[PDB]
Amino acid sequence: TAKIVIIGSYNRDLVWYVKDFPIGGQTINGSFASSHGGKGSNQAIACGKVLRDPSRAFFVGAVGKDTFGDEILAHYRELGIPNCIKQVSGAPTGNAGIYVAESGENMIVISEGANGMLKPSLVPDLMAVLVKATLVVMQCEISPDNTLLFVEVIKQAKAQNSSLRFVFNPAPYRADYDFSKILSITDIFCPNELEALEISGTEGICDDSMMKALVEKMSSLSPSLKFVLFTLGSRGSRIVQTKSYESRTVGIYSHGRAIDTSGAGDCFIGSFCVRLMELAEESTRGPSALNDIDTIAEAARFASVAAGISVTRKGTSASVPRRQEVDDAL
Amino acid sequence: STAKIVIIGSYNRDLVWYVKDFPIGGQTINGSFASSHGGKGSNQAIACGKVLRDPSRAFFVGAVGKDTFGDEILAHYRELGIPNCIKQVSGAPTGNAGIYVAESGENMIVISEGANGMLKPSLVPDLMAVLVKATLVVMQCEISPDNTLLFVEVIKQAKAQNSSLRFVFNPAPYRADYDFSKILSITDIFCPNELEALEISGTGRICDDSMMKALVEKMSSLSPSLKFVLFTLGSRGSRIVQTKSYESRTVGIYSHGRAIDTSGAGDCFIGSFCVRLMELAEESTRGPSALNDIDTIAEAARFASVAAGISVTRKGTSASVPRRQEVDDALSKFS
């Protein structure tokens, strides 16, 4: 039975590796690789791989009736991750055209495709799974209006299941998302530095005063918001509690030389959820342990270690470590 | 049925995303995706087949992978009726390109040459037999530099046996790793655009008549074979300059209607130019040495302009290359 529900995107990543980004009008040569991607699916695969039993993760997404769509369903079967990936006839499977420069910088163009069809009506049995789960996770790679439909289902599910926490990762930043409505049922908000800056309006660096002001602005309109986990890159992460503005700093874990940071944010969000869901069971206070800032901090230390291992390897989802390796480095 | 135009070059599956503006480094944006046939080698061979009266006079030489894209392009050539010896290899996948097209029309292109890097003479051991009976052989810059030089040696040996064979070299896209000096030494007709000509001499960035003399001068200085440089000037048309004498012929654009998509219009120009060049070498009292006359070169380029001018009124890379009757019809009204 599923305890972590990931509702989000699948994209087939088509990636060209170049020395430098081409400039406008320029034709350059590069090296090509194709791989499974999409922030929603990346986070579900990271959950399944870091979980002690992958059957506790559950991925919700929509793909096309094409080869890419067939291959990702077969891949989830091979991974042992339950899902209700619906194949639709309207659009092709989503993809992304990606340029990776030798510095590590990215350029990403997504063709959302079938991700634009993911609605609650496409997945009629979602409510039954959500009223028994601990975490539900969403990103910004499906359509804004369909995200709001899922928000309404989750809002109904949390009123029936008080143990459910909604983790919202606002990635990538999309100006057309109604963040106010999403935050009204969000329990833990997980932006990175640039995403937090675009959602605030007030350059390139988040200071302590800006992070407190963002928590205040977001929490003033939200009865559910309890924690903001700011992802700060080389600075690590900051957990700030709403109302009290209690803060915990969690540093970068340095496992070794950085080879490939692709997928490292999704691995962090996935690993973070795995440990959150486990701490809700390994605790006397129960799922109300997810209201204590030190529980959130321990999960983030766990996520930092797993993401820190991920950057010493290559291949996005193939870089997500074993549970034992994370246990060892902790 | 005997092949008269041999195109040795690349096939790329074009993977194209249409965006409002190019993303900046570290940015994720949304776009619209389309997949289509590309490769400068294959585009120019397909333009030949469509502008030719009988497509069997064109012949495409290229390498693709033993994958889906490779199977589809072999089948595609069959439906077009264009002979080829597309070799399928297991070393690499079929070549592709990841392309961003902004609403301005500007491109960003990254090529993964893939199986195009395996195209060597040894992969096509019977090429010499075809080249010694052909009129034109055409190459670009989308296979490997070292293998291009191997093909250059084959062509040098073919021209010594077939004095009617002419080498048309379109140096696209500009590659700093190409030994252009060695390629030009057996090139008969060189077809750069303004920027490609400027990069092959040592500059970066309209260049005037005194500048073009120095460029033609440098191109010809080490080549015993170079006879004409056809400068492609985009909306300004083209410019044919003879080596040694610098006789010049200007060939303006032919405007067919509202420009919709200039994608593939250089390749359509090169292909049509070769079709008409090959035809003028047959329709003449003086033999293939008609290809040594600057006015014959000019007539081939007038034909290529009309075909390119039609292609820019249509969308679709090689889908916008017109049929010969369409080219013949518009050439009549233009005269």
XYZ file of C-alpha atoms in Angstrom:
665
model
C 0.000 0.000 0.000
C 1.364 3.376 -1.139
C 2.509 5.953 1.429
C 4.270 8.446 -0.915
C 2.236 9.662 -3.901
C 4.043 11.590 -6.654
C 1.703 13.374 -9.100
C 3.719 14.826 -11.957
C 5.536 14.769 -15.250
C 7.379 12.263 -17.367
C 9.689 13.618 -20.081
C 12.020 11.723 -22.384
C 15.258 13.679 -22.001
C 17.154 14.160 -25.274
C 20.517 15.610 -24.258
C 23.433 17.028 -26.260
C 26.755 17.498 -24.445
C 28.781 20.415 -25.790
C 31.880 22.366 -24.842
C 29.963 25.643 -24.871
C 26.384 26.622 -25.529
C 25.888 27.567 -29.184
C 25.123 31.216 -29.752
C 22.195 32.361 -31.881
C 22.626 31.287 -35.478
C 25.527 28.931 -34.683
C 25.903 25.254 -35.621
C 28.205 23.296 -33.303
C 28.900 19.604 -32.692
C 28.123 17.669 -29.523
C 27.562 14.246 -28.000
C 24.048 12.830 -27.648
C 22.355 10.743 -24.962
C 18.700 9.917 -24.337
C 17.389 9.204 -20.853
C 14.269 9.068 -18.692
C 13.393 12.416 -17.124
C 10.588 14.656 -16.002
C 10.663 16.092 -12.490
C 7.672 14.058 -11.356
C 9.066 10.737 -12.565
C 12.589 11.546 -11.392
C 11.261 12.105 -7.890
C 9.253 8.869 -7.971
C 12.248 6.867 -9.178
C 14.448 8.400 -6.472
C 11.800 7.409 -3.914
C 11.588 3.845 -5.188
C 15.376 3.497 -5.166
C 15.950 5.016 -1.711
C 12.944 3.265 -0.146
C 13.437 0.033 1.754
C 10.497 -1.401 -0.229
C 9.651 0.420 -3.487
C 5.963 -0.561 -3.178
C 5.444 2.403 -0.806
C 5.969 4.886 -3.677
C 3.227 5.615 -6.198
C 3.659 7.709 -9.356
C 0.794 9.510 -11.125
C 1.389 10.814 -14.654
C 0.227 10.703 -18.257
C 2.171 9.624 -21.344
C 1.370 9.133 -25.017
C 0.574 5.979 -26.977
C 4.055 5.837 -28.486
C 7.375 4.080 -27.989
C 8.540 6.530 -25.314
C 5.237 5.971 -23.521
C 5.546 2.196 -23.685
C 9.178 2.246 -22.547
C 8.555 4.266 -19.393
C 5.680 1.993 -18.296
C 7.935 -1.008 -18.851
C 10.697 0.780 -16.937
C 8.441 1.297 -13.906
C 7.523 -2.392 -14.011
C 11.255 -3.212 -14.065
C 11.768 -0.866 -11.097
C 8.900 -2.297 -9.053
C 7.293 1.118 -8.498
C 3.465 1.104 -8.463
C 1.886 3.717 -10.698
C -1.217 4.684 -12.643
C 0.553 6.045 -15.713
C -2.344 6.588 -18.137
C -1.586 6.416 -21.857
C -3.529 9.043 -23.797
C -4.197 9.407 -27.506
C -4.286 13.204 -27.605
C -0.591 14.053 -27.309
C 2.812 12.365 -27.579
C 4.852 11.576 -24.511
C 6.476 14.718 -23.178
C 10.124 15.345 -23.957
C 12.894 17.844 -23.265
C 15.608 19.152 -25.560
C 18.612 19.787 -23.342
C 22.057 21.330 -23.901
C 24.679 20.531 -21.238
C 27.854 22.642 -21.357
C 31.160 21.421 -19.921
C 30.724 23.824 -17.006
C 27.629 21.903 -15.906
C 25.159 24.584 -16.987
C 21.898 23.522 -18.664
C 19.463 24.780 -21.250
C 16.123 22.964 -21.092
C 13.194 23.182 -23.497
C 10.222 21.000 -22.558
C 7.485 19.894 -24.956
C 4.932 19.017 -22.284
C 2.910 16.735 -24.568
C 0.793 14.221 -22.673
C 1.748 15.895 -19.382
C -0.833 18.517 -20.337
C -3.594 15.888 -20.142
C -2.942 14.777 -16.554
C -6.214 15.609 -14.730
C -7.967 13.975 -11.751
C -10.611 12.594 -14.129
C -7.867 10.678 -15.955
C -6.994 8.991 -12.632
C -10.391 8.353 -10.964
C -8.982 6.158 -8.157
C -6.563 8.782 -6.826
C -8.734 9.796 -3.859
C -8.760 6.228 -2.497
C -4.951 6.085 -2.459
C -4.499 9.598 -1.046
C -6.762 9.073 1.987
C -4.322 6.395 3.154
C -0.961 8.015 2.226
C 1.530 10.087 4.228
C 3.044 12.319 1.536
C 1.818 13.720 -1.769
C 4.350 15.529 -3.977
C 3.863 17.783 -7.003
C 6.062 20.002 -9.194
C 5.487 22.463 -12.074
C 5.748 20.283 -15.174
C 2.044 19.640 -15.756
C -0.512 22.249 -16.757
C -1.452 25.079 -14.337
C -5.227 24.492 -14.547
C -4.859 20.752 -14.055
C -2.571 21.359 -11.090
C -5.425 23.300 -9.479
C -7.816 20.397 -10.048
C -5.336 18.135 -8.247
C -5.084 20.737 -5.478
C -8.842 20.392 -4.954
C -8.604 16.581 -4.739
C -5.693 16.769 -2.276
C -7.544 19.340 -0.168
C -10.452 16.902 0.080
C -8.054 14.046 0.848
C -6.299 15.809 3.715
C -9.631 16.600 5.395
C -10.364 12.846 5.342
C -6.777 11.757 6.148
C -5.174 14.041 8.764
C -1.917 12.154 8.380
C -1.366 13.391 4.817
C 1.241 16.114 4.145
C 1.497 17.931 0.793
C 5.099 18.592 -0.333
C 5.256 21.186 -3.127
C 8.459 21.580 -5.159
C 7.889 24.684 -7.372
C 10.272 23.556 -10.101
C 10.883 24.847 -12.665
C 9.617 28.346 -11.908
C 6.461 28.949 -13.966
C 4.887 32.398 -13.928
C 1.485 30.949 -14.948
C 1.022 28.847 -11.773
C -1.469 30.079 -9.148
C 1.030 29.685 -6.301
C -1.366 31.314 -3.837
C -3.955 28.577 -4.352
C -1.375 25.774 -4.267
C 0.175 27.100 -1.050
C -3.234 27.155 0.677
C -3.017 23.355 1.106
C 0.796 23.031 1.025
C 2.414 21.691 4.197
C 6.097 21.854 3.221
C 7.227 24.230 0.446
C 10.559 23.393 -1.232
C 11.846 26.109 -3.574
C 15.416 26.580 -4.623
C 17.143 29.966 -4.520
C 16.016 31.332 -7.905
C 12.481 29.953 -7.520
C 12.100 31.556 -4.092
C 13.343 34.865 -5.506
C 10.862 34.860 -8.401
C 7.988 33.928 -6.093
C 8.857 36.826 -3.766
C 9.467 39.719 -6.171
C 12.200 41.253 -3.992
C 19.394 39.634 -6.344
C 20.665 36.116 -6.982
C 21.225 35.481 -3.247
C 18.698 34.797 -0.470
C 19.568 36.403 2.845
C 18.065 35.561 6.222
C 15.708 38.543 6.152
C 14.364 37.685 2.703
C 13.689 34.089 3.706
C 11.763 35.204 6.802
C 9.762 37.708 4.730
C 8.891 35.026 2.194
C 7.694 32.627 4.899
C 5.561 35.407 6.369
C 3.992 36.353 3.035
C 3.266 32.744 2.094
C 2.036 31.778 5.571
C -0.322 34.755 5.986
C -2.730 33.301 3.394
C -2.201 29.572 4.135
C -3.625 27.620 7.105
C -1.567 24.542 6.224
C 1.927 25.916 5.541
C 4.259 24.664 8.240
C 7.795 24.652 6.810
C 9.733 26.162 3.945
C 12.840 24.267 2.859
C 14.957 26.699 0.854
C 17.454 24.972 -1.446
C 20.555 27.174 -1.562
C 23.012 25.304 -3.787
C 26.547 25.526 -2.463
C 25.153 26.939 0.805
C 23.035 23.847 1.497
C 19.480 24.318 2.699
C 17.489 26.266 5.276
C 14.345 25.031 7.005
C 12.140 27.801 8.372
C 9.004 27.129 10.407
C 5.964 29.341 9.835
C 4.635 31.663 12.591
C 7.736 31.197 14.788
C 10.438 31.485 12.069
C 12.520 28.798 13.754
C 15.386 27.907 11.437
C 17.618 24.899 10.900
C 20.669 24.982 8.629
C 21.639 21.781 6.802
C 24.916 21.810 4.936
C 26.009 20.363 1.640
C 27.298 16.821 1.939
C 30.583 16.430 0.046
C 30.924 12.797 -1.023
C 33.673 13.484 -3.553
C 34.518 15.167 -6.834
C 31.440 16.429 -8.690
C 31.004 14.593 -12.008
C 27.300 15.124 -12.817
C 24.703 17.140 -10.882
C 21.846 16.244 -13.257
C 18.792 15.112 -11.328
C 20.400 16.049 -8.007
C 17.512 18.319 -7.003
C 14.936 15.627 -7.766
C 17.022 13.070 -5.875
C 17.035 15.500 -2.942
C 13.260 15.944 -3.033
C 12.716 12.194 -3.408
C 15.144 11.237 -0.630
C 13.684 13.963 1.580
C 10.209 12.464 1.202
C 11.392 8.908 1.886
C 12.923 9.878 5.221
C 9.929 12.086 6.085
C 7.521 9.198 5.519
C 9.728 6.853 7.570
C 10.046 9.280 10.497
C 6.255 9.479 10.579
C 6.300 5.746 11.425
C 9.455 5.441 13.570
C 8.111 7.940 16.126
C 5.772 7.808 19.114
C 4.102 11.144 18.297
C 3.118 9.620 14.949
C 2.604 11.613 11.761
C 2.459 14.671 14.008
C 6.239 14.205 14.163
C 6.125 15.937 10.761
C 5.185 19.125 12.637
C 8.495 19.277 14.573
C 11.318 21.173 12.866
C 13.983 18.680 13.980
C 12.146 15.884 12.166
C 12.261 18.006 9.008
C 15.963 18.711 9.611
C 16.837 15.026 9.973
C 15.053 14.243 6.722
C 16.979 17.051 5.027
C 20.294 15.739 6.346
C 19.296 12.386 4.849
C 18.413 14.072 1.549
C 21.664 16.066 1.569
C 23.724 12.880 1.895
C 21.848 11.104 -0.903
C 22.043 14.116 -3.220
C 25.711 14.582 -2.321
C 26.408 11.016 -3.435
C 24.383 11.578 -6.607
C 26.678 14.365 -7.823
C 29.767 12.110 -7.812
C 28.076 9.849 -10.415
C 26.475 10.325 -13.845
C 23.196 9.410 -15.513
C 20.416 11.255 -13.632
C 18.330 8.440 -12.096
C 21.213 5.959 -12.327
C 23.101 8.298 -9.959
C 20.611 7.874 -7.098
C 22.422 5.864 -4.394
C 21.451 2.716 -2.564
C 19.753 3.066 0.792
C 22.769 1.359 2.412
C 25.243 3.912 1.022
C 23.150 6.740 2.467
C 23.013 4.892 5.793
C 26.810 4.450 5.719
C 27.708 8.075 4.999
C 25.309 9.272 7.721
C 19.314 5.594 -64.587
C 23.072 6.134 -64.653
C 23.842 8.398 -61.715
C 25.035 11.854 -62.756
C 25.010 13.639 -59.364
C 26.706 11.884 -56.435
C 26.254 13.484 -52.996
C 28.619 12.218 -50.294
C 27.498 13.544 -46.935
C 25.423 13.396 -43.812
C 21.966 12.349 -42.748
C 20.712 13.808 -39.473
C 17.337 13.292 -37.848
C 16.405 16.868 -36.926
C 14.925 17.186 -33.420
C 13.469 20.686 -33.266
C 11.856 22.700 -30.470
C 9.998 25.927 -31.262
C 10.351 28.488 -28.472
C 9.520 32.146 -28.024
C 13.175 32.940 -27.316
C 16.274 30.865 -26.793
C 16.599 29.794 -23.157
C 19.487 31.306 -21.269
C 21.980 29.173 -19.355
C 20.339 27.534 -16.355
C 16.805 28.352 -17.560
C 13.990 25.873 -18.264
C 11.328 27.020 -20.762
C 8.478 25.381 -22.692
C 8.394 24.806 -26.443
C 6.772 22.909 -29.309
C 8.507 19.844 -30.784
C 8.814 18.483 -34.328
C 10.922 15.686 -35.825
C 12.075 15.733 -39.437
C 14.679 14.564 -41.946
C 17.868 16.609 -42.117
C 21.575 16.414 -42.760
C 23.102 18.719 -45.345
C 24.183 15.734 -47.416
C 20.744 14.149 -47.475
C 18.850 17.434 -47.888
C 20.854 18.291 -50.989
C 20.350 14.798 -52.418
C 16.596 15.018 -51.815
C 16.456 18.442 -53.487
C 18.226 16.909 -56.501
C 15.693 14.089 -56.721
C 12.736 16.478 -56.561
C 14.035 19.033 -59.070
C 15.351 16.368 -61.451
C 13.146 15.243 -64.316
C 14.036 11.605 -63.542
C 15.148 11.257 -59.886
C 17.374 8.248 -60.642
C 20.112 10.653 -61.836
C 20.872 11.574 -58.213
C 22.788 9.242 -55.909
C 23.176 9.705 -52.151
C 26.165 8.271 -50.274
C 25.891 8.261 -46.483
C 25.939 6.174 -43.315
C 23.218 5.719 -40.674
C 22.805 3.472 -37.658
C 21.084 0.116 -37.343
C 18.190 1.793 -35.563
C 14.710 3.127 -36.257
C 15.848 6.458 -37.738
C 18.241 4.616 -40.045
C 15.524 2.247 -41.246
C 13.100 5.122 -41.842
C 15.462 7.130 -44.038
C 16.286 4.139 -46.274
C 12.554 3.581 -46.694
C 12.060 7.309 -47.304
C 14.526 7.275 -50.195
C 12.651 4.345 -51.743
C 9.351 6.237 -51.761
C 11.186 9.169 -53.399
C 12.832 6.908 -55.992
C 16.350 8.266 -55.368
C 19.166 5.693 -55.699
C 21.650 5.560 -52.857
C 24.134 3.349 -51.057
C 23.169 4.352 -47.505
C 25.200 1.944 -45.387
C 23.731 0.971 -42.004
C 26.448 0.611 -39.326
C 26.367 -0.630 -35.726
C 29.192 1.539 -34.380
C 27.104 4.655 -33.766
C 23.408 5.593 -33.824
C 21.988 7.561 -36.730
C 23.114 11.177 -36.558
C 20.788 13.801 -35.140
C 20.552 17.516 -34.413
C 18.965 19.227 -31.419
C 17.551 22.493 -32.695
C 15.996 25.530 -31.012
C 14.034 27.880 -33.271
C 13.123 31.255 -31.772
C 10.152 33.302 -32.972
C 12.672 35.548 -34.731
C 13.579 32.601 -36.968
C 17.061 32.243 -35.508
C 18.451 28.765 -34.839
C 20.673 26.977 -32.388
C 21.925 23.682 -33.820
C 23.925 20.979 -32.056
C 24.852 18.012 -34.252
C 25.653 14.560 -32.886
C 27.316 13.210 -36.007
C 26.877 9.603 -34.897
C 27.013 7.221 -37.834
C 28.011 10.075 -40.150
C 31.454 9.700 -38.581
C 31.805 6.163 -40.022
C 31.342 7.203 -43.686
C 34.746 6.383 -45.240
C 35.609 5.182 -48.750
C 36.120 1.648 -47.388
C 32.482 1.597 -46.219
C 31.379 2.261 -49.822
C 33.987 0.263 -51.767
C 32.183 0.567 -55.128
C 31.992 4.365 -55.170
C 34.781 4.701 -57.749
C 32.709 2.884 -60.380
C 29.881 5.414 -59.988
C 32.128 8.489 -59.867
C 33.910 7.694 -63.155
C 30.565 7.940 -64.989
C 29.068 10.914 -63.109
C 29.169 14.648 -63.904
C 29.040 16.167 -60.406
C 30.098 15.035 -56.951
C 28.956 17.139 -53.969
C 30.242 17.290 -50.388
C 29.649 19.418 -47.280
C 31.098 19.581 -43.753
C 28.873 17.214 -41.733
C 31.022 14.059 -41.809
C 34.403 13.561 -40.148
C 37.386 15.728 -41.200
C 39.729 12.767 -41.710
C 37.156 10.814 -43.724
C 36.435 13.841 -45.906
C 40.131 13.850 -46.834
C 39.879 10.164 -47.696
C 36.925 10.943 -49.975
C 38.909 13.843 -51.455
C 41.595 11.377 -52.525
C 38.970 9.130 -54.130
C 37.579 12.088 -56.077
C 41.076 13.154 -57.177
C 41.551 9.659 -58.606
C 38.088 9.729 -60.210
C 38.661 13.043 -61.976
C 41.899 11.755 -63.495
C 39.848 8.966 -65.090
C 36.723 11.042 -65.869
C 37.612 14.516 -67.163
C 33.923 15.467 -67.167
C 33.589 15.074 -63.382
C 33.339 18.320 -61.393
C 33.619 18.568 -57.591
C 31.119 20.991 -56.009
C 32.039 21.740 -52.379
C 29.543 23.523 -50.104
C 31.542 24.292 -46.901
C 28.570 24.100 -44.518
C 28.531 24.453 -41.580
C 31.856 26.158 -40.919
C 34.148 23.775 -39.029
C 37.490 24.938 -37.690
C 38.753 21.328 -37.797
C 38.306 20.933 -41.583
C 41.381 21.026 -43.823
C 39.717 23.338 -46.331
C 42.992 23.946 -48.145
C 43.271 20.232 -48.948
C 39.611 19.986 -49.987
C 39.864 23.046 -52.237
C 42.809 21.569 -54.177
C 40.393 19.223 -55.973
C 37.327 21.451 -55.698
C 36.096 22.732 -59.035
C 33.228 24.942 -57.788
C 33.258 26.365 -54.245
C 29.929 27.513 -52.738
C 30.395 29.442 -49.494
C 28.001 31.925 -48.041
C 29.369 35.263 -46.821
C 30.238 34.134 -43.278
C 31.607 30.745 -44.362
C 33.893 32.467 -46.873
C 35.024 34.922 -44.201
C 35.792 32.205 -41.662
C 37.834 30.103 -44.106
C 40.228 33.003 -44.801
C 40.838 34.291 -41.254
C 38.153 36.932 -40.546
C 34.853 36.967 -38.679
C 32.437 39.680 -39.827
C 28.505 43.137 -46.029
C 31.915 42.644 -47.693
C 32.557 44.612 -50.900
C 34.092 43.823 -54.314
C 37.676 44.418 -53.211
C 37.090 42.063 -50.282
C 35.698 39.335 -52.536
C 38.735 39.508 -54.830
C 41.034 38.842 -51.891
C 38.758 36.003 -50.758
C 38.667 34.402 -54.225
C 42.429 35.007 -54.385
C 43.107 33.120 -51.154
C 40.757 30.267 -52.063
C 42.441 29.765 -55.434
C 46.049 30.237 -54.302
C 46.722 26.574 -53.425
C 44.221 24.867 -55.756
C 45.050 23.716 -59.303
C 41.380 22.850 -59.932
C 39.274 25.724 -58.530
C 37.456 27.473 -61.372
C 34.520 29.319 -59.776
C 33.464 30.541 -56.355
C 29.688 30.856 -56.037
C 29.091 33.223 -53.113
C 25.702 32.719 -51.477
C 24.476 36.064 -50.183
C 21.046 35.187 -48.794
C 18.489 37.867 -49.580
C 21.110 39.646 -51.730
C 21.191 36.643 -54.104
C 24.459 35.070 -55.249
C 27.750 36.008 -56.877
C 29.842 33.903 -59.258
C 33.518 34.850 -59.497
C 35.935 33.153 -61.879
C 39.401 32.392 -60.545
C 42.483 34.086 -62.083
C 40.433 36.558 -64.173
C 37.783 37.541 -61.579
C 34.982 37.766 -64.129
C 31.801 38.146 -62.125
C 28.115 37.350 -62.673
C 25.410 38.594 -60.291
C 22.310 36.416 -59.829
C 19.529 38.133 -57.903
C 16.944 36.411 -55.762
C 13.690 35.285 -57.324
C 10.817 36.323 -55.078
C 7.923 33.875 -55.376
C 5.745 35.254 -52.584
C 5.627 35.797 -48.852
C 8.551 34.148 -47.110
C 7.296 31.620 -44.566
C 10.325 29.461 -43.734
C 13.895 29.768 -45.068
C 14.837 26.430 -43.479
C 16.537 24.217 -46.016
C 16.748 26.964 -48.622
C 20.527 26.841 -48.976
C 20.413 23.101 -49.538
C 17.597 23.467 -52.047
C 19.733 26.075 -53.815
C 22.775 23.802 -53.892
C 20.709 20.843 -55.089
C 18.936 22.770 -57.854
C 22.216 24.387 -58.930
C 23.692 20.905 -59.372
C 20.652 19.616 -61.280
C 20.786 22.480 -63.797
C 24.588 22.362 -63.939
C 24.476 18.661 -64.792
C 21.800 19.275 -67.435
C 23.693 22.093 -69.155
C 26.691 19.746 -69.462
C 24.543 17.441 -71.638
C 22.626 20.020 -73.693
C 25.757 21.511 -75.204
C 27.876 21.226 -78.322
C 31.106 21.842 -76.393
C 30.636 18.989 -73.917
C 31.155 19.069 -70.144
C 33.724 21.820 -70.769
C 30.626 24.018 -70.877
C 30.998 23.837 -67.100
C 34.130 25.988 -67.579
C 32.056 28.941 -68.922
C 30.944 31.547 -66.387
C 27.680 32.170 -68.232
C 26.818 28.453 -68.029
C 27.502 28.657 -64.288
C 25.296 31.750 -64.204
C 22.396 29.995 -65.939
C 22.545 27.135 -63.429
C 22.421 29.661 -60.577
C 19.431 31.517 -62.074
C 17.600 28.191 -62.021
C 18.697 27.566 -58.430
C 17.444 31.010 -57.363
C 13.950 30.345 -58.735
C 13.801 26.997 -56.931
C 15.090 28.507 -53.681
C 12.692 31.427 -54.038
C 9.797 28.989 -54.241
C 11.059 26.966 -51.252
C 11.083 30.024 -48.965
C 7.338 30.447 -49.602
C 6.742 27.017 -48.027
C 7.435 25.352 -44.688
C 9.215 22.041 -44.263
C 12.988 21.894 -44.989
C 12.982 19.478 -47.931
C 9.172 19.318 -48.000
C 9.370 22.850 -49.427
C 11.640 21.877 -52.311
C 9.383 22.301 -55.377
C 8.687 19.897 -58.219
C 10.511 20.510 -61.506
C 7.364 21.628 -63.344
C 6.802 24.248 -60.637
C 10.376 25.484 -61.147
C 10.050 25.383 -64.949
C 6.723 27.234 -64.826
C 7.944 30.102 -62.640
C 11.163 30.415 -64.675
C 9.031 31.081 -67.772
C 7.038 33.902 -66.170
C 10.284 35.343 -64.739
C 11.636 35.568 -68.305
